Amino acid sequence: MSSTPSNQNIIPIIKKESIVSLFEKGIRQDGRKLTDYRPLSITLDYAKKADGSALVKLGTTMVLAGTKLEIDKPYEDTPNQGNLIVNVELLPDENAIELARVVDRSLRDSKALDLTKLVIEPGKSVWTVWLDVYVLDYGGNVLDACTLASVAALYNTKVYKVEQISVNKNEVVGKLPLNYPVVTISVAKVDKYLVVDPDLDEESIMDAKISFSYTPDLKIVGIQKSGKGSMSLQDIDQAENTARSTAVKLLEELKKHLGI
């Protein structure tokens, strides 16, 4: 049973009017233009006992994602596929579950990770990729940071030698079958303006936000409208143009962090 959150720290009409007056001049509180992403940090191999991990700082938002690989029997329905299990946890559920699914969907539908290559003995044994994403600092636009931390954690993942039946965890065979990275870009609709990567303040004054997932060849690979309000037709159209021309820049930057 899903209900309107009684927490959600209301933000006065006067403060909203201050932020909107800045938007009218195409500048924000942080200083960035309406279309700018926040400063992006990625530290790879942060959690040492993970098979692969990534700590992402997008503005004040911090996500740590880590992968853990295991060998299981493939699930009777999908006999020639490995498994990917995404899991999000907020620390400061329902939003968590929604976050997990949105990320999962965009990693799986893009085929950024090829599950059919995670097979060891078809029908007998396959790899299961456990992806676990931990939001440590809720600085707004958690979704975009999650997609980044996820993708990064997968690109950092080390696969081990298989005794065929048993894992030898100190011989590294290779990396995950990853076709390409994926980015998610969230565009917030505050009043009558579209704003890329909304911060904590902007998310609490916005009508709704819409999130676009892209592959490097700029195919839309997932869309999620989110928020208590509505958005016009022309808005979603414009949002996606903005979202996409942002994706190019974010992808280049993500790649620099991930090494090529």
């Binding site: 899903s2 309107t4 329902e94 939003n95």
Partner: protein, 248 residues
């Protein structure tokens, strides 16, 4: 003999322009709407799109059980999306699935943009929704059944909510999907609107699309929504509406 291997996935667009259920790419499924069907609810509605049947009950603005969970200025919407174990071909476990949990949040947020909650502070409006038959588009059939059940409960709203799932099947953009089209199509994009305000209430895409396709799929969805909306307004007048599937 790679030579005889032929894709496992079935063709979704077939002879003539047409699809697996004999519809053209621009045709809705049959629609049936009935209002005030539950006596003990504050507002109720049954919505059918083809083989997808949802029932929605509303238990109207009431004081909230544990007062600390209520809102000082707003009503709290409580929304439940649920599939009966016999809604699908194989039996769905009654215990709530992560997919049901997500769909509930998305449906609630959708309704929150339509319902004027700023009118009933310290109250809760309860919207329960079962899916009695699932054949794709069930998150939208549910949302619309809810929107209508709210209107039936006489609860003030900015507009009614109308919605279709638009998709891409065999490189062709199609309107209102089968379970079969949802299964094997490239893309599945549910869109819900407040048509008179041109406001998008719910918007999702699972699958893959080029920016232009996305924009085409977008224009077709609107047209479908507009036809459904008309039936909703009709169903509000006469309590009962039946529409044979046909071209947008």
């Amino acid at each position: 003999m790679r030579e005889m291997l032929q894709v496992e996935r079935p063709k979704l667009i077939l002879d003539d322009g047409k699809r697996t259920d004999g519809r053209k790419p621009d045709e809705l499924r049959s629609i049936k709407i009935e209002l005030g069907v539950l006596k003990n609810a504050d507002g109720s509605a049954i919505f059918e799109m083809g083989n997808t049947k949802a029932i929605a009950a509303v238990y109207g603005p009431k004081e909230m059980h544990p007062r600390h969970l209520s809102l000082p200025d707003r009503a709290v919407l409580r929304v439940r999306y649920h599939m009966t174990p016999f809604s699908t071909d194989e039996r769905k476990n009654p215990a709530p699935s992560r997919r049901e949990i997500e769909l509930s949040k998305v449906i609630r947020e959708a309704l929150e943009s339509a319902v004027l909650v700023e009118l009933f502070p310290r109250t809760a409006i309860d919207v329960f929704t079962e899916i009695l038959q699932a054949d794709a588009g069930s998150r939208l059939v549910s949302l619309m059944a809810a929107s209508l059940a709210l209107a039936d409960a006489g609860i003030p709203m900015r507009d009614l909510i109308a919605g279709v799932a638009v998709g891409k099947a065999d490189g062709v953009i199609i309107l209102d999907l089968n379970e079969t089209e949802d299964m094997w199509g490239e893309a599945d994009m549910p869109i819900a609107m407040m048509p008179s305000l041109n406001q998008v209430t719910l918007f999702q895409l699972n699958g893959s699309m080029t920016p232009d396709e996305f924009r085409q799929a977008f224009d077709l969805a609107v047209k479908g929504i507009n036809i459904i909306y008309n039936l909703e307004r009709e169903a509000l007048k006469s309590k009962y509406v039946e529409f044979k599937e046909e071209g947008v």
